[PDB]
A paper describes a structure:
Histone acetyltransferases (HATs), including p300/CBP and PCAF/GCN5, are responsible for modification of histones by acetylation on the exposed lysines. Metazoan PCAF/GCN5 proteins have three conserved domains–N terminal extension region, HAT domain and bromodomain (BRD). The HAT domain of PCAF/GCN5 has a globular structure that contains an acetyl-CoA binding pocket. In comparison, PCAF mainly acetylates lysine 14 on H3 and also specifically acetylates p53 at lysine 320 to enhance responses to DNA damage.
The PCAF HAT domain (amino acids 493-658) was purified and crystallized in a unique condition that contained 1.2 M ammonium sulfate and 0.2 M lithium sulfate. To our surprise, we found four HAT domains in one asymmetric unit. The overall structure is similar to the PCAF structure (rmsd of 0.397 for Cα backbone) solved by Marmorstein and his co-workers, except for the loop 1 (L1), which was not defined due to lack of clear electron density (indicated by arrow). We found that the four PCAF HAT domains in one asymmetric unit form two different dimers. The first dimer is formed by four-helical stacking of helices α1 and α2 and has a canonical interface with a buried surface area of 1530 Å2. The four residues Leu512, Val516, Thr535 and Phe539 from both monomers form a central hydrophobic core, while Gln519 and Asn520 create four pairs of hydrogen bonds. The second dimer of the PCAF HAT domain is mediated through the ß-sheet extension of two antiparallel ß1 strands. The major contacts of this dimer are three hydrogen bonds between amino acids 493-495. The buried surface area of this interface is 879 Å2. While the first interface is significant, however, the second interface may likely be produced during crystal packing due to the smaller size and insignificant score calculated by PISA program.
Residue numbers in the entry:
A (entry chain A), B (entry chain D): 492 to 502, 507 to 652
Write the structure that this text describes.
Protein backbone atom coordinates (compact mmCIF):
# COMPACT_ATOMS: atom_id res chain seq x y z
CA UNK A 1 0.00 0.00 0.00
CA UNK A 2 3.01 2.25 0.65
CA UNK A 3 6.23 1.30 -1.08
CA UNK A 4 9.53 3.16 -1.11
CA UNK A 5 12.95 2.94 -2.75
CA UNK A 6 16.03 4.15 -0.90
CA UNK A 7 19.66 3.99 -1.79
CA UNK A 8 21.28 3.54 1.62
CA UNK A 9 24.76 3.25 2.91
CA UNK A 10 27.00 3.01 5.92
CA UNK A 11 29.34 5.97 5.43
CA UNK A 12 24.88 6.23 10.73
CA UNK A 13 21.35 7.25 11.69
CA UNK A 14 18.89 5.04 13.55
CA UNK A 15 16.35 4.48 10.80
CA UNK A 16 18.67 3.42 7.98
CA UNK A 17 20.43 1.22 10.49
CA UNK A 18 17.22 -0.75 11.06
CA UNK A 19 17.01 -0.90 7.25
CA UNK A 20 20.62 -2.06 7.01
CA UNK A 21 19.86 -4.92 9.41
CA UNK A 22 16.63 -5.65 7.60
CA UNK A 23 18.54 -5.88 4.31
CA UNK A 24 21.16 -8.13 5.83
CA UNK A 25 18.30 -10.32 7.17
CA UNK A 26 16.55 -10.43 3.74
CA UNK A 27 19.83 -11.30 1.95
CA UNK A 28 20.90 -14.03 4.35
CA UNK A 29 17.50 -15.74 4.01
CA UNK A 30 17.51 -15.88 0.21
CA UNK A 31 21.22 -16.26 -0.53
CA UNK A 32 21.95 -19.55 1.26
CA UNK A 33 25.34 -19.79 -0.48
CA UNK A 34 26.39 -16.56 1.26
CA UNK A 35 27.56 -16.75 4.89
CA UNK A 36 25.77 -14.23 7.09
CA UNK A 37 29.04 -12.68 8.23
CA UNK A 38 30.14 -12.05 4.65
CA UNK A 39 26.82 -10.35 3.79
CA UNK A 40 27.14 -8.22 6.94
CA UNK A 41 30.64 -7.28 5.84
CA UNK A 42 29.68 -6.15 2.33
CA UNK A 43 26.38 -4.62 3.36
CA UNK A 44 28.07 -2.42 5.95
CA UNK A 45 31.07 -1.70 3.75
CA UNK A 46 31.08 2.09 3.05
CA UNK A 47 32.16 1.45 -0.56
CA UNK A 48 28.91 -0.48 -1.03
CA UNK A 49 25.52 1.16 -1.14
CA UNK A 50 22.29 -0.81 -1.08
CA UNK A 51 19.08 0.08 -2.90
CA UNK A 52 16.35 -0.89 -0.38
CA UNK A 53 12.71 -1.80 -1.10
CA UNK A 54 10.56 -0.72 1.85
CA UNK A 55 6.95 -1.83 2.11
CA UNK A 56 4.80 -0.43 4.92
CA UNK A 57 7.82 0.25 7.12
CA UNK A 58 9.48 -3.10 6.51
CA UNK A 59 12.39 -4.05 4.27
CA UNK A 60 11.22 -6.67 1.73
CA UNK A 61 13.98 -6.48 -0.85
CA UNK A 62 17.18 -4.86 -1.97
CA UNK A 63 20.09 -4.78 -4.31
CA UNK A 64 23.58 -4.38 -2.83
CA UNK A 65 25.93 -2.86 -5.39
CA UNK A 66 29.44 -1.46 -5.59
CA UNK A 67 30.12 1.44 -7.99
CA UNK A 68 33.41 1.70 -9.88
CA UNK A 69 33.06 5.11 -11.55
CA UNK A 70 36.74 4.78 -12.60
CA UNK A 71 36.11 1.47 -14.43
CA UNK A 72 32.80 2.56 -15.96
CA UNK A 73 30.61 -0.21 -14.51
CA UNK A 74 28.87 -1.28 -11.33
CA UNK A 75 29.25 -4.62 -9.61
CA UNK A 76 25.92 -6.08 -8.45
CA UNK A 77 26.43 -8.17 -5.33
CA UNK A 78 23.43 -9.48 -3.39
CA UNK A 79 19.96 -8.87 -4.86
CA UNK A 80 16.93 -10.44 -3.20
CA UNK A 81 13.24 -10.19 -2.66
CA UNK A 82 11.75 -11.80 0.43
CA UNK A 83 9.82 -15.04 -0.16
CA UNK A 84 6.33 -13.74 0.46
CA UNK A 85 6.80 -11.02 -2.14
CA UNK A 86 8.42 -12.98 -4.97
CA UNK A 87 6.82 -12.95 -8.43
CA UNK A 88 5.01 -9.64 -8.03
CA UNK A 89 7.50 -7.74 -10.21
CA UNK A 90 9.33 -6.14 -7.25
CA UNK A 91 12.67 -7.49 -8.42
CA UNK A 92 12.25 -5.94 -11.86
CA UNK A 93 11.29 -2.60 -10.33
CA UNK A 94 14.47 -2.66 -8.19
CA UNK A 95 16.64 -3.30 -11.21
CA UNK A 96 14.78 -0.59 -13.14
CA UNK A 97 15.29 1.96 -10.38
CA UNK A 98 18.92 0.83 -10.01
CA UNK A 99 19.26 1.41 -13.77
CA UNK A 100 17.90 4.97 -13.50
CA UNK A 101 20.10 5.86 -10.51
CA UNK A 102 23.12 4.92 -12.61
CA UNK A 103 22.14 6.82 -15.75
CA UNK A 104 22.19 10.00 -13.64
CA UNK A 105 25.66 9.04 -12.33
CA UNK A 106 26.81 8.09 -15.81
CA UNK A 107 27.69 4.47 -15.23
CA UNK A 108 26.16 2.57 -18.17
CA UNK A 109 27.41 -0.92 -17.29
CA UNK A 110 26.38 -3.64 -14.88
CA UNK A 111 28.39 -6.69 -13.86
CA UNK A 112 27.35 -9.57 -11.67
CA UNK A 113 28.35 -13.18 -10.93
CA UNK A 114 25.08 -15.07 -11.27
CA UNK A 115 23.80 -17.98 -9.19
CA UNK A 116 22.68 -20.90 -11.41
CA UNK A 117 19.07 -20.49 -10.32
CA UNK A 118 18.80 -16.80 -11.03
CA UNK A 119 20.49 -16.49 -14.42
CA UNK A 120 16.88 -16.54 -15.58
CA UNK A 121 16.06 -13.29 -13.77
CA UNK A 122 19.13 -11.43 -15.02
CA UNK A 123 18.47 -12.37 -18.63
CA UNK A 124 15.07 -10.68 -18.23
CA UNK A 125 16.72 -7.47 -17.03
CA UNK A 126 18.93 -7.51 -20.11
CA UNK A 127 22.06 -9.21 -18.78
CA UNK A 128 23.95 -11.55 -21.10
CA UNK A 129 26.66 -14.17 -20.64
CA UNK A 130 28.52 -12.29 -23.36
CA UNK A 131 30.31 -9.24 -22.04
CA UNK A 132 31.02 -6.02 -23.92
CA UNK A 133 33.32 -4.33 -21.43
CA UNK A 134 36.97 -5.45 -21.99
CA UNK A 135 38.46 -7.85 -19.41
CA UNK A 136 41.08 -5.28 -18.46
CA UNK A 137 38.39 -3.13 -16.83
CA UNK A 138 36.89 -5.42 -14.20
CA UNK A 139 39.34 -8.28 -13.65
CA UNK A 140 40.82 -7.73 -10.17
CA UNK A 141 38.21 -5.16 -9.11
CA UNK A 142 35.22 -7.47 -9.16
CA UNK A 143 34.70 -10.39 -6.73
CA UNK A 144 34.73 -13.76 -8.49
CA UNK A 145 32.35 -16.33 -6.98
CA UNK A 146 32.35 -20.12 -6.94
CA UNK A 147 30.27 -21.56 -9.76
CA UNK A 148 28.45 -18.31 -10.42
CA UNK A 149 28.56 -17.25 -14.08
CA UNK A 150 29.48 -13.68 -15.04
CA UNK A 151 26.88 -11.58 -16.85
CA UNK A 152 26.92 -8.05 -18.19
CA UNK A 153 24.36 -5.37 -18.95
CA UNK A 154 25.02 -2.24 -21.01
CA UNK A 155 22.40 0.40 -20.20
CA UNK A 156 21.70 3.42 -22.40
CA UNK A 157 20.26 6.95 -22.44
CA UNK B 1 39.44 -23.53 18.77
CA UNK B 2 39.41 -19.86 19.80
CA UNK B 3 36.45 -18.70 21.86
CA UNK B 4 35.96 -15.15 23.11
CA UNK B 5 33.70 -13.29 25.48
CA UNK B 6 33.17 -9.58 24.85
CA UNK B 7 30.71 -7.26 26.50
CA UNK B 8 29.54 -5.04 23.59
CA UNK B 9 27.07 -2.23 22.86
CA UNK B 10 26.13 0.72 20.67
CA UNK B 11 27.07 3.28 23.32
CA UNK B 12 31.67 3.03 14.82
CA UNK B 13 34.20 0.23 15.30
CA UNK B 14 33.99 -2.07 12.28
CA UNK B 15 34.45 -5.20 14.38
CA UNK B 16 31.67 -4.70 16.90
CA UNK B 17 29.17 -3.61 14.28
CA UNK B 18 29.56 -7.01 12.59
CA UNK B 19 29.23 -8.60 16.03
CA UNK B 20 26.06 -6.71 16.92
CA UNK B 21 24.49 -7.79 13.65
CA UNK B 22 25.73 -11.36 14.12
CA UNK B 23 24.02 -11.18 17.54
CA UNK B 24 20.78 -9.91 16.03
CA UNK B 25 20.81 -12.86 13.60
CA UNK B 26 21.31 -15.42 16.37
CA UNK B 27 18.66 -13.77 18.57
CA UNK B 28 16.24 -13.59 15.66
CA UNK B 29 16.60 -17.26 14.59
CA UNK B 30 16.24 -18.55 18.15
CA UNK B 31 13.38 -16.44 19.46
CA UNK B 32 10.38 -16.55 17.10
CA UNK B 33 8.13 -14.67 19.55
CA UNK B 34 10.27 -11.56 19.13
CA UNK B 35 10.10 -9.69 15.77
CA UNK B 36 13.45 -9.01 14.08
CA UNK B 37 13.04 -5.24 14.16
CA UNK B 38 12.34 -5.19 17.89
CA UNK B 39 15.53 -7.25 18.51
CA UNK B 40 17.45 -4.83 16.27
CA UNK B 41 16.10 -1.87 18.23
CA UNK B 42 17.07 -3.18 21.65
CA UNK B 43 20.38 -4.70 20.63
CA UNK B 44 21.60 -1.38 19.22
CA UNK B 45 20.12 0.62 22.05
CA UNK B 46 22.79 2.55 24.02
CA UNK B 47 21.27 1.51 27.36
CA UNK B 48 21.40 -2.17 26.40
CA UNK B 49 24.66 -4.11 26.46
CA UNK B 50 25.24 -7.58 25.08
CA UNK B 51 27.54 -10.40 26.03
CA UNK B 52 28.90 -11.86 22.76
CA UNK B 53 30.21 -15.43 22.49
CA UNK B 54 32.59 -15.46 19.52
CA UNK B 55 33.86 -18.71 18.08
CA UNK B 56 36.65 -18.55 15.51
CA UNK B 57 35.58 -15.09 14.37
CA UNK B 58 31.84 -15.60 14.45
CA UNK B 59 29.04 -14.91 16.88
CA UNK B 60 27.44 -18.16 18.05
CA UNK B 61 25.64 -16.92 21.15
CA UNK B 62 24.82 -13.98 23.33
CA UNK B 63 22.97 -12.47 26.23
CA UNK B 64 21.44 -9.01 25.79
CA UNK B 65 20.89 -7.26 29.13
CA UNK B 66 20.02 -3.87 30.46
CA UNK B 67 21.63 -2.82 33.75
CA UNK B 68 19.51 -1.19 36.46
CA UNK B 69 22.03 0.12 39.00
CA UNK B 70 19.42 2.50 40.43
CA UNK B 71 17.21 -0.51 41.14
CA UNK B 72 19.47 -3.37 42.19
CA UNK B 73 19.04 -5.87 39.39
CA UNK B 74 19.82 -6.49 35.75
CA UNK B 75 17.02 -7.26 33.30
CA UNK B 76 17.67 -10.14 30.91
CA UNK B 77 16.17 -9.38 27.49
CA UNK B 78 17.43 -11.93 24.99
CA UNK B 79 19.80 -14.84 25.21
CA UNK B 80 20.46 -17.62 22.76
CA UNK B 81 22.98 -20.02 21.33
CA UNK B 82 23.07 -20.68 17.61
CA UNK B 83 21.75 -24.13 16.77
CA UNK B 84 24.92 -25.93 15.77
CA UNK B 85 26.29 -25.21 19.19
CA UNK B 86 23.44 -25.94 21.61
CA UNK B 87 23.77 -28.55 24.35
CA UNK B 88 27.51 -27.90 24.66
CA UNK B 89 27.52 -26.05 27.98
CA UNK B 90 27.92 -22.83 25.98
CA UNK B 91 24.91 -21.04 27.43
CA UNK B 92 25.85 -22.14 30.92
CA UNK B 93 29.26 -20.57 30.31
CA UNK B 94 27.70 -17.35 29.03
CA UNK B 95 25.45 -17.03 32.04
CA UNK B 96 28.26 -17.86 34.45
CA UNK B 97 30.42 -15.16 32.87
CA UNK B 98 27.50 -12.72 32.95
CA UNK B 99 27.29 -13.42 36.71
CA UNK B 100 30.98 -12.58 37.17
CA UNK B 101 30.66 -9.34 35.20
CA UNK B 102 27.89 -8.17 37.51
CA UNK B 103 29.41 -9.19 40.80
CA UNK B 104 32.39 -7.09 39.64
CA UNK B 105 29.80 -4.36 39.19
CA UNK B 106 27.77 -4.69 42.36
CA UNK B 107 24.39 -5.78 40.96
CA UNK B 108 23.38 -9.02 42.60
CA UNK B 109 19.95 -9.86 41.21
CA UNK B 110 19.05 -11.05 37.72
CA UNK B 111 15.52 -10.74 36.40
CA UNK B 112 14.05 -12.24 33.24
CA UNK B 113 10.70 -12.93 31.63
CA UNK B 114 11.24 -16.53 30.60
CA UNK B 115 9.41 -18.16 27.71
CA UNK B 116 7.59 -21.42 28.09
CA UNK B 117 10.35 -23.60 26.78
CA UNK B 118 13.47 -22.31 28.48
CA UNK B 119 12.04 -22.22 31.98
CA UNK B 120 13.93 -25.52 31.99
CA UNK B 121 17.24 -23.80 31.19
CA UNK B 122 16.96 -20.90 33.64
CA UNK B 123 15.88 -23.13 36.53
CA UNK B 124 19.31 -24.78 36.32
CA UNK B 125 21.17 -21.46 36.43
CA UNK B 126 19.72 -20.86 39.88
CA UNK B 127 16.85 -19.03 38.20
CA UNK B 128 13.41 -19.48 39.77
CA UNK B 129 9.81 -18.25 39.71
CA UNK B 130 9.57 -16.75 43.20
CA UNK B 131 11.22 -13.33 43.36
CA UNK B 132 12.84 -11.99 46.54
CA UNK B 133 13.28 -8.43 45.32
CA UNK B 134 10.23 -6.22 45.94
CA UNK B 135 7.71 -5.87 43.12
CA UNK B 136 8.01 -2.10 43.44
CA UNK B 137 11.69 -2.30 42.51
CA UNK B 138 11.29 -3.72 39.03
CA UNK B 139 7.71 -3.35 37.83
CA UNK B 140 7.48 -0.84 35.01
CA UNK B 141 11.25 -0.71 34.88
CA UNK B 142 11.26 -4.23 33.41
CA UNK B 143 9.32 -5.13 30.24
CA UNK B 144 6.51 -7.66 30.68
CA UNK B 145 6.53 -10.35 27.97
CA UNK B 146 3.32 -12.04 27.04
CA UNK B 147 2.83 -15.53 28.37
CA UNK B 148 6.42 -15.63 29.52
CA UNK B 149 7.06 -16.46 33.18
CA UNK B 150 8.95 -13.90 35.27
CA UNK B 151 12.00 -15.43 36.98
CA UNK B 152 14.91 -14.37 39.17
CA UNK B 153 17.99 -15.58 41.02
CA UNK B 154 20.92 -14.23 43.04
CA UNK B 155 24.61 -14.90 42.43
CA UNK B 156 27.33 -15.20 45.08
CA UNK B 157 30.45 -13.01 45.16
C1 LIG C 1 15.42 -13.44 -8.25
C2 LIG C 1 14.55 -12.42 -7.50
C3 LIG C 1 15.44 -11.32 -6.95
C4 LIG C 1 13.46 -11.84 -8.52
O1 LIG C 1 12.52 -10.95 -7.90
P1 LIG C 1 10.97 -11.25 -8.13
O2 LIG C 1 10.04 -10.03 -7.78
O3 LIG C 1 10.59 -12.46 -7.26
O4 LIG C 1 10.79 -11.66 -9.67
P2 LIG C 1 9.91 -10.80 -10.62
O5 LIG C 1 8.52 -10.68 -10.07
O6 LIG C 1 10.53 -9.40 -10.69
O7 LIG C 1 9.90 -11.38 -12.06
C5 LIG C 1 11.04 -11.11 -12.93
C6 LIG C 1 11.07 -11.85 -14.19
O8 LIG C 1 12.22 -12.75 -14.24
C7 LIG C 1 11.70 -14.04 -14.34
N1 LIG C 1 12.64 -15.00 -13.78
C8 LIG C 1 13.44 -15.85 -14.44
N2 LIG C 1 14.12 -16.60 -13.55
C9 LIG C 1 13.72 -16.23 -12.32
C10 LIG C 1 14.07 -16.64 -11.04
N3 LIG C 1 15.11 -17.67 -10.88
N4 LIG C 1 13.47 -16.06 -9.98
C11 LIG C 1 12.55 -15.08 -10.14
N5 LIG C 1 12.20 -14.64 -11.37
C12 LIG C 1 12.77 -15.20 -12.45
C13 LIG C 1 10.31 -13.92 -13.74
O9 LIG C 1 9.46 -14.95 -14.22
C14 LIG C 1 9.92 -12.69 -14.30
O10 LIG C 1 9.66 -12.89 -15.72
P3 LIG C 1 8.54 -12.04 -16.53
O11 LIG C 1 8.07 -10.83 -15.70
O12 LIG C 1 9.14 -11.57 -17.78
O13 LIG C 1 7.36 -12.93 -16.83
C15 LIG C 1 13.80 -13.10 -6.35
O14 LIG C 1 12.98 -14.15 -6.79
C16 LIG C 1 14.75 -13.64 -5.26
O15 LIG C 1 14.95 -12.99 -4.20
N6 LIG C 1 15.37 -14.98 -5.42
C17 LIG C 1 16.21 -15.51 -4.31
C18 LIG C 1 17.64 -15.01 -4.20
C19 LIG C 1 18.39 -14.93 -5.47
O16 LIG C 1 18.31 -15.92 -6.31
N7 LIG C 1 19.20 -13.74 -5.81
C20 LIG C 1 20.09 -13.74 -7.01
C21 LIG C 1 19.65 -12.80 -8.14
S1 LIG C 1 18.73 -11.31 -7.68
C1 LIG D 1 18.51 -22.63 25.81
C2 LIG D 1 19.86 -22.12 25.27
C3 LIG D 1 19.96 -20.60 25.44
C4 LIG D 1 21.05 -22.85 26.08
O1 LIG D 1 22.26 -23.06 25.32
P1 LIG D 1 22.93 -24.51 25.41
O2 LIG D 1 24.48 -24.43 25.11
O3 LIG D 1 22.24 -25.41 24.38
O4 LIG D 1 22.64 -25.04 26.91
P2 LIG D 1 23.74 -25.89 27.64
O5 LIG D 1 24.56 -26.69 26.67
O6 LIG D 1 24.63 -24.92 28.45
O7 LIG D 1 23.04 -26.88 28.64
C5 LIG D 1 22.58 -26.35 29.92
C6 LIG D 1 21.74 -27.24 30.72
O8 LIG D 1 20.35 -26.80 30.64
C7 LIG D 1 19.63 -27.82 30.02
N1 LIG D 1 18.56 -27.25 29.18
C8 LIG D 1 17.31 -26.93 29.57
N2 LIG D 1 16.65 -26.43 28.50
C9 LIG D 1 17.49 -26.45 27.43
C10 LIG D 1 17.35 -26.07 26.08
N3 LIG D 1 16.08 -25.47 25.60
N4 LIG D 1 18.42 -26.23 25.25
C11 LIG D 1 19.61 -26.74 25.68
N5 LIG D 1 19.76 -27.11 26.97
C12 LIG D 1 18.73 -26.99 27.86
C13 LIG D 1 20.66 -28.75 29.37
O9 LIG D 1 20.21 -30.11 29.37
C14 LIG D 1 21.78 -28.58 30.22
O10 LIG D 1 21.70 -29.52 31.32
P3 LIG D 1 23.00 -30.29 31.87
O11 LIG D 1 24.25 -29.45 31.60
O12 LIG D 1 22.85 -30.50 33.30
O13 LIG D 1 23.12 -31.60 31.15
C15 LIG D 1 19.95 -22.50 23.77
O14 LIG D 1 19.58 -23.83 23.54
C16 LIG D 1 19.09 -21.57 22.89
O15 LIG D 1 19.57 -20.59 22.27
N6 LIG D 1 17.66 -21.92 22.67
C17 LIG D 1 16.80 -21.09 21.78
C18 LIG D 1 16.26 -19.81 22.40
C19 LIG D 1 16.06 -19.85 23.86
O16 LIG D 1 15.43 -20.83 24.43
N7 LIG D 1 16.58 -18.79 24.72
C20 LIG D 1 16.29 -18.83 26.18
C21 LIG D 1 17.01 -17.79 27.04
S1 LIG D 1 18.78 -18.00 27.27
Amino acid sequence: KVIEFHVVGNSPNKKILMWLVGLQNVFSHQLPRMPKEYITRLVFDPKHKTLALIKDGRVIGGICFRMFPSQGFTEIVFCAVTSNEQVKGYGTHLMNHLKEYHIKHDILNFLTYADEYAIGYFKKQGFSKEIKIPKTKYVGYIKDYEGATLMGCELNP
